């Protein structure tokens, strides 16, 4: 719990710094250091759920605090400050928890989906990592939580499928293939 608090403290410290002085700030000691606490925090979270062996207990205790701490934080971050590893970290947990998380896709996809989509829908170049990861995530949900794609409204579903079209139109081999 505390670890999530500090993660969020740093995540909000970084985004502000960027919002106040542009991407450039990322390129200096303190920020790069704060990025590290975030990234290792994510490694730890995903690194454990992977080797965990009690899906439900994991979905009912270690997942909900992720929502406000890491997801809605990723949402509120300025585009330049959002952590790509947040998406891939989440992708891994979907692969593991599967059906036990199918009911949280609504809550999750809200935060990350649309907001991330708007970062990668202008061209095919900017925010590479965000492209790659985002679709590892979308792949995972579709793969182990398909029922979710039915719960949501036709308007949202469409937005999802057309996102896939968008994937396989990429010139980055990996992104287009995942699509």
């Amino acid at each position: 719990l505390d670890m999530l608090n500090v993660y969020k403290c740093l995540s909000e410290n970084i985004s502000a710094a960027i919002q106040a002085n542009g991407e450039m700030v990322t390129k200096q000691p303190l920020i790069r250091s704060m990025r590290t606490v975030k990234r290792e925090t994510l490694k730890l979270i995903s690194g454990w759920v992977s080797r965990s062996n009690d899906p439900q207990m994991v979905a009912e205790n270690f997942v909900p605090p992720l929502l406000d701490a890491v997801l809605i934080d990723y949402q509120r971050n300025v585009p330049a400050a959002r952590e790509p590893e947040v998406l891939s970290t989440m992708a891994i947990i979907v692969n593991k928890l599967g059906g036990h998380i199918t009911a949280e896709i609504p809550q999750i996809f809200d935060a990350v989906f649309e907001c991330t989509l708007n970062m990668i829908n202008k061209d095919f170049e900017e925010y590479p990592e965000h492209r790659t990861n985002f679709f590892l995530l979308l792949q995972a949900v579709n793969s182990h939580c398909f029922p979710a794609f039915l719960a949501i409204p036709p308007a949202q579903f469409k937005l999802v499928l057309d996102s896939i079209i968008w994937a396989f139109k990429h010139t980055m081999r990996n992104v287009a293939d995942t699509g």
Partner: protein, 173 residues
């Protein structure tokens, strides 16, 4: 300290541009912005036998951004074919690139580079990379993302062009 013309070729996303940038700036480009036609880039290495300059003709891999394709190669003095170990397709087309190139340059020191070794899930096992053998090309495993065997291709070409099997990079002012 004379120079040489180095033509760099391969499929798209192969990492041709990214490879070149690393050398001059030291930075690593994460984005994929396809090269239109060509982009001559002068590179300099300092050896024990005086400075050496490569005019890198970073050409395009994509078919619609081709350019004066075979037209760029003329007057070349060495080349580098590059493929991506994460995509077999880019290794199966290597023969096509070596083709166009030698039909323009009959005898020039060439190097074959398998880029992207850093990515753990490698789809092109070393066991398969044998094309250089019968065509008498040099080969290396490289990564623009980790500087792995970073300077091998250039060090080797230098050995050949300066006719010295003992040339060594030193980075002396």
């Amino acid at each position: 300290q004379v120079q040489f013309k180095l033509v760099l070729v391969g499929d798209g996303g192969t990492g041709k541009t990214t490879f070149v940038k690393r050398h001059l700036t030291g930075e690593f480009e994460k984005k994929y912005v396809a090269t239109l036609g060509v982009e001559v880039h002068p590179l300099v290495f300092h050896t024990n036998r005086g400075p050496i300059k490569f005019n890198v003709w970073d050409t395009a891999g994509l078919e619609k951004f081709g350019g004066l394709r075979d037209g760029y190669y003329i007057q070349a003095q060495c080349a580098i074919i590059m493929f991506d170990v994460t995509s077999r397709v880019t290794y199966k087309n290597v023969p096509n690139w070596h083709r166009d190139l030698v039909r323009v340059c009959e005898n020039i020191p060439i190097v074959l580079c398998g880029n992207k070794v850093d990515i753990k899930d490698r789809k092109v096992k070393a066991k398969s990379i044998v094309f250089h053998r019968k065509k008498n090309l040099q080969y290396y495993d490289i990564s623009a993302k980790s500087n792995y065997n970073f300077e091998k291709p250039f060090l080797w070409l230098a050995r050949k062009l300066i006719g010295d099997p003992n040339l060594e990079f030193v980075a002396m002012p």
